[PDB]
Design a protein around this nucleic acid. Structure first.
Ligand SMILES: Nc1ncnc2c1ncn2[C@@H]1O[C@H](COP(=O)(O)OP(=O)(O)OP(O)(O)=S)[C@@H](O)[C@H]1O
Ligand SMILES: Nc1ncnc2c1ncn2[C@@H]1O[C@H](COP(=O)(O)OP(=O)(O)OP(O)(O)=S)[C@@H](O)[C@H]1O
Ligand SMILES: Nc1ncnc2c1ncn2[C@@H]1O[C@H](COP(=O)(O)OP(=O)(O)OP(O)(O)=S)[C@@H](O)[C@H]1O
Ligand SMILES: [Mg+2]
Ligand SMILES: [Mg+2]
Ligand SMILES: [Mg+2]
Ligand SMILES: [Mg+2]
Ligand SMILES: [Mg+2]
Lengths: 312, 48, 312, 312, 313, 309, 312
DNA sequence: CTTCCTCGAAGGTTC
DNA sequence: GAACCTTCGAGGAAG
């Protein structure tokens, strides 16, 4: 299966795995439920996958739902009534829950009870629902949307980080076995270097190369086929798109490397002001091709050697 | 006369009255023999 | 019917056809559906027709809907339950779909399941639906309009471009062959040159010219007939629409040639910003009638000579 | 009735009238329905009347409704199902129907079939209805506000324009004969000049002057009698109305003639910004009473000298 | 009662009053009812009063109702059936009627009859309801929201306007004779000048001045007593309340005229946003003392000379 | 009792109190009912208290309800039907009545009649002469046609130090607590001009005097109790002083944005804007500016800092 | 028990704790209900805990409910109707009550009565429901969300403040006795200094160290084990998390200390603007590591000596 | 019908 | 004078 099922199969995230192992083992010795845990970080790094792994290691059934599925307080109360001792409740995209519902978890997470209004309406009163011991697992792309009192209740925080080329190379190889395609070790590294450090991107590129190799090739992803397939997709050997190449080339040829303002640049490339700032520039800065400055952005020496121009 | 009675009841319903209330209103009219227009005209007047 | 049904009948877009041919043929060796595809570009270029071609080549049914057509999660759930194994779901203007609904597709696209609450009152409970394999085809004007978590789930991307005179000429000749009509090479060339590079316009004008030639002519289309027909309509000698003329005229006379922003210009011509940005501005820019600058749009000398003003 | 029944009786609109004649007769020779037609422009120019003429010229039964009258897909479905081959469907204010209603219109106009979701809860199916050939006719006051994908489906466009004195003078006489009122060639000319160029306004004034001539005269509309009545109606010799006079006077006396924006003005005088822009601004602009500028509208010297104010 | 009953007593509104008089006689010169009439204008100018006068001038009974009270088509058709030939139906706030009723009103206004269609279409029949001739009179504060089909049926439009000082003064004189109080013409002008042009406001002020004049004076409204009464109440000679003056003073003194936001201005005067934007701001804009800009409210030169502060661009 | 019963006991509000006496005396002289009155203004100034005073001075029995309790037209019709000639109906928090109810009140106020549909039939009810009294903090929320029918408008104003001093002494006698005049003045200065706040402080000082003292308030016990509560001689709380101190010492008086200032003191943005700034602005310690807010010279002098232009 | 039950067990909050003692004792001497109390301030400082302590000191039963559970006036009326003389009503998250429901408390708190509609038709009536003496206690983190007339009715206001190192050390030692854990005073002080001043954070660190101490150690918390566990969690001796350190390092090494804008800084650390402003920046400012200026963020002298750089 | 929030404007600093 | 950053104010759309 694509999604790893156990910590032995989960490559990378050493900092998170090393901690979770210690906390999971300790909880078993006491025969207690694991503390509430929040998984957060950039898109596609493996947050959802880790949530299922935690359940398999704990050895319990997983109850699954999502933030957008909980439309009103009555929905959450129904889900909580279905919990059994030791069950794990996983809520994906937890930031989408409405504030009127998020404030209901405040009591459930700390004291395992809920206040509910009951009665015929002629006579009605507030009563406590007592919940069995349970573990809430949450996953989100933007923890900043959660209210301060909710984040403070999670006992274990897991922050995901980008993968390095050695580990990302193994993910490409493992996926090749599942697809039953032979891949040369040199080609696995080529795909990894272009995957922007993200596992989801590495799988997408592999699927496209796989399709090409079996339609016009010998069914083997050799070093020669990968270069041809990657050229068709127009992915630079640094993962830059034609748009990314145009940006750097324009700064080097029309401005001598800058400084140049974002407005001035956006016009010369026929790109929308905010699209450049949010879709293309963030990766270029993190790789070190561009540097922001008080007077504008400048192309670094790395951009010169990559495009072949002479640095001055 | 069932056409004129139903016509008045059906016409009254077309004006937004409920089928039961429209039926009672038209059913409450004494003369069944009156023409459909008079039945609906009288029924509508009685609703004021 | 006029709409092409197979790749052999779809003229142009060679760059897109060549890639889809490989991915569709590879997907047929294996007994599985094609990966979710995203098509983007100017409107009216023939992206909807592409969805039909893919469905006929894959040999499955095609279902259609639109972003604005979906307002609540209950709508999307009902549509997905109506899909047969391998069906294709086409969503037009996918970028305009509500954010609370978009987050429901995430699980559907990546794992083919949906978590939903069903019933009311004491019957309210969560259910985990398992969808059959399906292919989603989304259409949008720009890639930068979609959110990062959605764009990351599409496995294939296709950029469509305007047709050139040799292609539009063949499309007009083909369209004038479905109707039992006769058109000379010069008339077909003249009509295509005026068709703003868009096949949808080419077909609409051809119908009108045919009507004119049947009543005001001998039922044969000649350069003399095309000129008169096109002259009777508002189509200028180079395809500019009445709205196009209105824009250029307004910029030169009311703004003195600019610079002026599209936001402020839209309210002066009483046109909705999205239409001028997505339908009219792109062509005026790609043909040099309008120039874009750091401060805003500027009319080029070509526009001055076309409208007959002096570029003082 | 007052409104004409055939092109022989429809005065003016030579361009629109001449175009439709060719297309209407061409459709009959081929024995097919007319293409979808969109009529747009200022209110009261005769858009609705043209629809009746088209139906009479085609020899078909007309069906009428309005945008605001249709609130849900089920509403439009009933109407479209109750159609006979060749029927003409006229929808006024088509730019105001909700986004959910347009969904059905696209498939109906493009292929004459619709897919309707039916059922709720466990019931979730769809029904396919095949519609007979029909022609949609739409009318609006604002064209730029019409949804871009919808506007592309109309194959024929008719742009209505203001009538001139030679046409309105004949219309006024025609109406006087229908009311059996006696009017001289001079009095009929005065009403036309001050009727603001719109047939609906001319008909209103004619009915009102009659009540005047029946007291201040022997029921004969003399030129002198007409002038005394028009001054009584507060109608300027230039056709300006109570609102037109109040607008210009407010600009001059409180804002030095402008520039002032459409919204700011609409707040001092109790009038809706849409009514000012839809019914007042267009005429005032064409007559040279107001001019548009980078910061809004300004009253020209003509307005100052006409209103009796010293120009700048 | 404080409402005039005939055009002989209806003070002001000379333009609309002149038009209706000619049309009413012309209709009376024939066996025809008056054309459907629509009255436009701000609240409190006398729209309801004019409706009663039109009925009395026509010499026909009047049925009075309001748009919000009409919930179903049956009510409208039933109400119309109670009408006799020539009766007048007055509908206030006609802009608030439900759309389901508007589509039926067209037939009554244009044809004076209703036809109802039934059957699937293959088999169908109609039923006709004939209505006696009648005249609909609608009153509305908002014209722009009335649909074009309905607007096209109304044949007479009447714009109401704010009363001028010479006429508004006469309304005070008339009202003062309904009570037992003597009022000097100069005093009556002082109240009219501060009545914001609305008859209802002038009557309210007169009542308050009466109470003072008969407790702190001899029960006579002379120029001196009027000044004292208009001093206990802080109504300025331009009609500005105490709070209205405080707004302008704050803008001139602490912000140099602005621009200043609504929130910033509200906390200074210790008032709620809604009160400033809905109770006080609207009249100040009509008088031209302040303007609204994307950056906030700003005081105009007209305000400076009224409050007595020097102005500079 | 804490609530005064007659104008002789109602301290302050000279403008509203003086006008109401003239109108009430005049109404009695004519044997007529008083016109409809709307009372509005800031919280805790005496709106509800005055409503009862009006009823006692007119010598009538007060009928009482509130806007939140009236949910449908049928409720109001039942309340109105119980009115007798000369009765006074008081509606507190009048701004909450549903729109369906306000429309019924138009005719009842101006024409004394109501036309209610009630087997369906219309019943026409004629109301006897009556006076409606309304109290609200959001007068701008009422419909424009409703405000136009009220004949008397009473806008409440803040109290002055001489009045608050007398109010504290009056309340002390109800609690049978002995308080000296100079001690009473110290509480008035800190009451922010609101009678309810002056009573709240007195209740707290009483508790301290009974536990940490001899049950008597004097210039010594008051100084100690106010130090425990940490209320400055200008009425500033601990958080109020922290805001001014932060602005003067970290930003040199500003300009500083609301967001930056809130994060620095660790308060919530909504709380600083709606709970602490209003009193600081009205007293002139802070001023809002196009680029932020700044501390005025009055703030420097009070906090004990050398002012610098 | 984990939550203190009496003032003798409640560490810290000297100001609030000292005031509540005096007011409680004075109320007992007069034998009357305590005045209404509002508790507000940051998360985890002890607001809920104090509410239970007040009830135990007063010697009465506590009736508990919450704002999210009260949704209509009928709910609040029913609760108030169940009160008995001297009862204490505690409402948590009191800011969530609808504004239409808060206005019911206005008369209940000041006059102990509410007005209710009873009967039907001619039997409908408004009646005063009289309430016995009672104390309302509310706790909220967003005091500014409450209406002005409601806050004015609370007679006692308690604003919670952060704890100090001596108190946090004693709290950690106390918690270390609920669980069976031996902890050296030096290790207790080491955790307290990293708890950011919040008791809930101190307990969370202790729980995480306990798990490590019994899995990677001998089950005893000593200077050697505490130092190792804190290194695994990567929490600086000043309480700075891994990301907090990365922020300062980037500002000091790439921008020379600033000024730098939040947008520029967020992109360099691969985080997003919302998380940096809402999660990390607030603690750095309140502790003096960062200064906000009109030009941007600046690192203070305190930050230079902590990270080990030279303050040139 | 209301809250939340984002879009547009403008004041100030620096090279 | 080109470019960044902070701040406020008024709309409008998502509950
Ligand atoms: N360590 C890993 N080893 C192997 N496959 C992985 C690993 N991490 C992620 N994947 C794969 O990457 C893909 C996406 O992983 P996800 O867990 O869904 O990412 P994500 O955190 O859910 O992204 P979101 O939900 O948009 S924030 C799946 O196909 C996973 O199987
Ligand atoms: N390559 C082609 N060959 C022939 N006809 C074509 C071609 N591409 C498009 N068309 C014609 O384009 C019309 C349909 O256009 P679409 O496929 O809907 O383009 P579109 O992008 O869907 O336009 P929309 O829906 O308005 S955004 C038909 O008349 C087709 O015959
Ligand atoms: N011309 C007039 N002469 C004398 N009194 C007048 C005149 N016009 C208005 N009034 C007075 O104004 C009062 C209110 O008149 P209305 O007809 O109710 O105004 P209105 O336009 O109906 O206000 P609405 O209905 O609340 S929008 C009447 O009771 C008269 O006393
Ligand atoms: Mg995920
Ligand atoms: Mg399409
Ligand atoms: Mg009125
Ligand atoms: Mg009160
Ligand atoms: Mg709590």
């Amino acid at each position: 299966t694509l999604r790893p099922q156990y910590f032995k199969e989960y490559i990378g995230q050493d900092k998170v795995k090393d901690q979770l192992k210690i906390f999971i083992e300790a909880a078993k010795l006491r025969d207690e439920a694991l503390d509430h845990t929040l998984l957060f970080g950039p898109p596609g790094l493996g947050k959802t996958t880790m949530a299922f792994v935690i359940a398999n290691e704990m050895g319990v059934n997983l109850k699954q739902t999502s933030g957008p599925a909980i439309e009103k307080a009555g929905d959450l109360v129904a889900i909580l009534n279905d919990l059994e001792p030791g069950d794990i409740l996983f809520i994906d995209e937890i930031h989408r829950m409405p504030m009127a519902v998020e404030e209901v978890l405040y009591s459930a997470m700390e004291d395992y009870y809920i206040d509910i209004m009951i009665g015929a309406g002629e006579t009605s009163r507030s009563v406590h629902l007592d919940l069995p011991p349970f573990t809430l697992v949450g996953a989100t792309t933007r923890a900043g949307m959660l209210s301060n009192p909710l984040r403070a209740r999670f006992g274990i925080n897991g922050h995901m980080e980008y993968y390095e080329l050695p580990d990302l190379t193994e993910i490409v190889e493992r996926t090749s076995e599942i697809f039953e395609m032979t891949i040369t070790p040199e080609a696995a590294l080529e795909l990894a270097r272009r995957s922007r450090g993200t596992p989801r991107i590495a799988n997408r590129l592999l699927k496209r190369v796989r399709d090409y190799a079996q339609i016009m090739g010998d069914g083997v992803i050799d070093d020669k086929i990968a270069d041809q397939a990657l050229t068709m997709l127009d992915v630079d050997h640094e993962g830059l798109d034609y748009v990314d190449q145009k940006i750097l080339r324009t700064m080097i040829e029309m401005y001598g490397g800058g400084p140049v303002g974002l407005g001035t640049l956006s016009v010369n490339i026929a790109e929308e002001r905010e699209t450049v700032e949010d879709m293309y520039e963030p990766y270029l800065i993190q790789k070190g091709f561009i540097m922001r400055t008080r007077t504008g952005r400048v192309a670094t020496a790395k951009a010169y050697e990559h495009m072949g121009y002479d640095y001055t | 006369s069932e056409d004129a009675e139903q016509e008045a009841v059906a016409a009254l319903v077309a004006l937004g009255y409920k089928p039961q209330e429209a039926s009672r209103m038209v059913s409450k009219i004494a003369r069944p023999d009156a023409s459909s227009e008079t039945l609906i005209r009288d029924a509508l007047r009685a609703a004021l």
